Amino acid sequence: SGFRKMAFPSGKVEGCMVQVTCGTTTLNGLWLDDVVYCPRHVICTSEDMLNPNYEDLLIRKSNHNFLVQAGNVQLRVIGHSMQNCVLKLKVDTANPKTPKYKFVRIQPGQTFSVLACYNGSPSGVYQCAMRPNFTIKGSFLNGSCGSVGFNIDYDCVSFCYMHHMELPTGVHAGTDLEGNFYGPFVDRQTAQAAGTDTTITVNVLAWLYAAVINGDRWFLNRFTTTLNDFNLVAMKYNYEPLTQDHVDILGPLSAQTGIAVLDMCASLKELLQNGMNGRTILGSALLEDEFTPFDVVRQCSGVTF
Amino acid sequence: SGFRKMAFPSGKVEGCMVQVTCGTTTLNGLWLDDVVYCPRHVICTSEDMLNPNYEDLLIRKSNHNFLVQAGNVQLRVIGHSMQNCVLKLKVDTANPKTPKYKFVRIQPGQTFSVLACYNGSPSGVYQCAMRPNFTIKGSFLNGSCGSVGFNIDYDCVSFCYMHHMELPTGVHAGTDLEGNFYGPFVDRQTAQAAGTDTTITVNVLAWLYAAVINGDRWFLNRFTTTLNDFNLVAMKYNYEPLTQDHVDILGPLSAQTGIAVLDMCASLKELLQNGMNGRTILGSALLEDEFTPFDVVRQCSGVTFQ
Ligand SMILES: CNC(=O)C1(N2C[C@]3(CCN(c4cncc5ccccc45)C3=O)c3cc(Cl)ccc3C2=O)CC1
Ligand SMILES: CNC(=O)C1(N2C[C@]3(CCN(c4cncc5ccccc45)C3=O)c3cc(Cl)ccc3C2=O)CC1
Ligand SMILES: [Cl-]
């Protein structure tokens, strides 16, 4: 019993974190095989950040301008190139701790673990979701750029996020490991803002199933609804639309608990229209949306890595 | 910016997790140097759990009755002994991944990371706090016994908890790494229950300071309180008494934000009276109590967003 915001074990990722320094800028890099990946803004001064020409800034750098430190060992940079908003530094040593990995681009609503890092050293691990507005509600300070997000499947690490910046509302923006931003953001210090966000409906339903599995059933009722009527109510409360794919994905949970997905949608409609009336669900007074259906099944089954 | 329930990176602990089996019973063990530590109830069948005589059960076992598996390698047990509610199995190989470590017994209110494990394999990591009633609100299934709790301040792992059982309310009980239970619990299937729990006042105050550091002050008020009048109110809401030690511990957060501890206590008294009126503090609609003053200093910026 119990239900916690749980991250994947971070060990396989800790063995890949290094420190990258270019002049006065020090940030984190990810060392896989003989390449270190890091945000391309490592080559920028504060003035360059106002309107950078990354190719022009990069041509003025030699391999020796990049100082890469893995623990207490200096790695020799033997090549450099840019891929979108990521800098790839070829080093003369393959990381002996390189795990089995893939680079994957995730969709809004998907969750992942973040290994927050400073000066190439891991400081903490926490669970995040890619918001519908393509930001993440992380916990990051200056020096955290280059920290990565990931999931694990069996023995394979799927890297999905690299940290680049913090927006004025204190939320975070970054790229996939191919340097493509999530959201309409750019790696420049120009006026940028998080758009209006929405709640991830399929995840709230998954968390209501987790509550039922754990014994919280007060919110259940005799009613059901249709997908169309439910989506009219979701649009009204700034919830994302629920699709037939989301209904199908929740199938196993509907079968285990005996509560149909549209039966749980009727519980969610009543919760939106009435509130909790002083009650809590899994120790929360808000409807939680950062657990996917897969996260709920995994935590309630004890899958190991 | 931001404020999350943040665990320590689990790598140093993952490299210590092993599987321990005695007959049909299997659970997790912690392998440090040449010793594997695990709950002593690995020597019990379900039929032994009501009134187990651990000394009588253990004397009937040889070293070779204990099967220890580290990854896909079988370790050889060359000695065994019981210390309180833990079993210590001496093995013929020192763990090459043993980190720098210490065993620390913590007090209620303290937080730690848990590496949930099954069959010697890590499944996830999360933050926990030792409740005032000496239980932890973990997330554990059958097979999780032997999973540990720890902190990693300054590169040394401080192991503080080893998981033993789940109480009828779904909360968890366990021991320090010397096998001494936290709370009045025993490793028996006899009727046991968590006592009435309370909210960790010093941690709620630390989290209110985290919110001020992160740029929010909506909950503050023009009032102050004496420590005794604050305790008289807080106890009516089932909050733990705030001591002068807790006031002293909050000194650094008070200095960083410019809000005296007793002035933050007045804010907390008002929040307990009024609720949040549709507002949230650090993304929560409830007053959070599983962040210590030390955790706030660890995670938050050293510069308040004024
Ligand atoms: C809040 N940011 C800032 O004050 C500044 N900034 C800096 C930066 C790099 C570091 N960084 C941060 C990343 N995560 C957390 C943070 C916390 C507190 C300060 C910074 C942080 C950035 O955002 C950056 C990167 C890119 Cl690709 C584009 C623009 C910026 C940027 O605007 C200084 C001006
Ligand atoms: C909830 N517990 C149980 O149903 C039973 N039980 C078993 C056990 C060992 C495993 N275990 C669990 C530990 N964490 C999570 C769990 C989740 C779900 C089942 C069990 C779990 C225990 O509690 C145990 C150990 C000790 Cl030292 C003392 C008593 C017990 C005990 O009562 C079976 C009867
Ligand atoms: Cl302590």
- The rounded distance, in Å, linking the Cα atoms of A58 and A56 is 5
* B5/A138 CB distance under 8 A: no
Q: Name the amino acid, one letter, at B86.
A: V
Within 8 A by CB and 6+ apart from A248, the residues are none
In chain B, residues with a C-beta closer than 8 Å to the C-beta of A1 are: 139-140, 166, 170-171
Q: Which residue shows structure tokens 């249709």?
A: A226
A165 within 8 A of A185, measured Cβ to Cβ: yes
Q: Which residue's CA is minimally distant from atom 31 of ligand 1?
A: A189
Determination method here? X-ray
- The rounded distance, in Å, linking the Cα atoms of B192 and B72 is 38
Residue from B25, B165, B185, B190 whose mutation best tests the ligand 2 pocket (most atoms within 8 A of CB)? B165
Half-sphere exposure of B10 toward its Cβ, with a 13 Å CA cutoff? 31
Interstrand relation of A86-91 and A111-118 (parallel, antiparallel or unpaired): unpaired
* B122/A283 CB distance under 8 A: no
Q: What does the block give as tokens for A152?
A: 């694990």
**Is the beta carbon of B145 within 6 A of some atom in ligand 2?**
yes
In chain B, residues with a C-beta closer than 8 Å to the C-beta of A4 are: 126-128, 137-139
Half-sphere exposure of A277 toward its Cβ, with a 13 Å CA cutoff? 6
Q: Name the amino acid, one letter, at B91.
A: V
- The rounded distance, in Å, linking the Cα atoms of A114 and B168 is 34
A170 within 8 A of A145, measured Cβ to Cβ: no
Chain A interface, Cβ < 8 Å to B:
1-12, 14-15, 115-116, 122-126, 128, 137-141, 166, 170-172, 214-215, 280, 283-286, 299-305
**Is the beta carbon of B62 within 6 A of some atom in ligand 2?**
no
Within 8 A by CB and 6+ apart from B215, the residues are A170, B1, B304, B305
In chain A, residues with a C-beta closer than 8 Å to the C-beta of B280 are: 286
Phi, psi of B241 (to 5 degrees): -65, 140
B101 within 8 A of B160, measured Cβ to Cβ: no
Half-sphere exposure of B129 toward its Cβ, with a 13 Å CA cutoff? 24
**Is the beta carbon of A165 within 6 A of some atom in ligand 1?**
yes
Nearest C-alpha in B relative to A141: B1
**Is the beta carbon of A140 within 6 A of some atom in ligand 1?**
yes
In chain A, residues with a C-beta closer than 8 Å to the C-beta of B151 are: none
CATH number of the B15-99 domain: 2.40.10.10
The beta-carbon neighbor of A6 closest among B139, B143, B301 is: B139
Give the number of whichever ligand sits closest to the CA of residue B107. Answer: 3
* A170/B125 CB distance under 8 A: no
| Residue ranges of chain A assigned to CATH 1.10.1840.10 | 198-301
**Is the beta carbon of B166 within 6 A of some atom in ligand 2?**
yes
Residue A80 parent element (H or E):
strand A77-83
Q: Is B240 exposed, middle or buried (0-12, 13-18, 19+ CB in 10 A)?
A: buried
**Is the beta carbon of A40 within 6 A of some atom in ligand 1?**
no
Phi, psi of B129 (to 5 degrees): -135, 150
Q: Could you tell me the distance, in angstroms and rounded to a whole number, from the CA of residue A224 to the centre of ligand 1? A: 47
Q: Could you tell me the distance, in angstroms and rounded to a whole number, from the CA of residue A18 to the centre of ligand 3? A: 32
Nearest C-alpha in B relative to A170: B1
Count of H-run helices and E-run strands, chain A: 8, 13
For residue B150, list its beta bridge partners: B113, B159
Give the number of whichever ligand sits closest to the CA of residue B105. Answer: 3
* B8/A283 CB distance under 8 A: no
Q: Is the dihedral of CA B161, B164, B167, B170 positive or negative?
A: positive
* CA distances for B255 relative to B116, B231, B260, angstroms: 37, 23, 8
- DSSP single-letter state for residue A195: P
The beta-carbon neighbor of A285 closest among B4, B121, B286 is: B286
Which of helix, strand or coil describes residue A75? Answer: strand
**Is the beta carbon of A171 within 6 A of some atom in ligand 1?**
no
Query: What CATH superfamily is the domain A1-14+100-197?
Result: Trypsin-like serine proteases (2.40.10.10)
Burial call B182-208: b when 16+ CB within 10 Å, e when fewer? bbebebebeeeebeebbbbbbbbbbbb
A85 within 8 A of A39, measured Cβ to Cβ: yes
Q: Could you tell me the distance, in angstroms and rounded to a whole number, from the CA of residue B248 to the centre of ligand 3? A: 15
- The rounded distance, in Å, linking the Cα atoms of A74 and A97 is 16
Which residues of B form the catalytic set? 41, 145
Kindly report the CA angle at B126 between B124 and B131, in degrees rounded to 5? 135
Half-sphere exposure of B265 toward its Cβ, with a 13 Å CA cutoff? 26
Half-sphere exposure of B165 toward its Cβ, with a 13 Å CA cutoff? 22
A193 within 8 A of A169, measured Cβ to Cβ: yes
Mention the CATH class of domain B198-301: mainly alpha
Kindly report the CA angle at B101 between B297 and B108, in degrees rounded to 5? 50
CA-nearest of B220, B207, B305 to B256 is: B305
- The rounded distance, in Å, linking the Cα atoms of A29 and A159 is 13
Nearest C-alpha in A relative to B275: A278
* A286/B299 CB distance under 8 A: no
- The rounded distance, in Å, linking the Cα atoms of B135 and B184 is 10
| Residue ranges of chain A assigned to CATH 2.40.10.10 | 1-14+100-197, 15-99
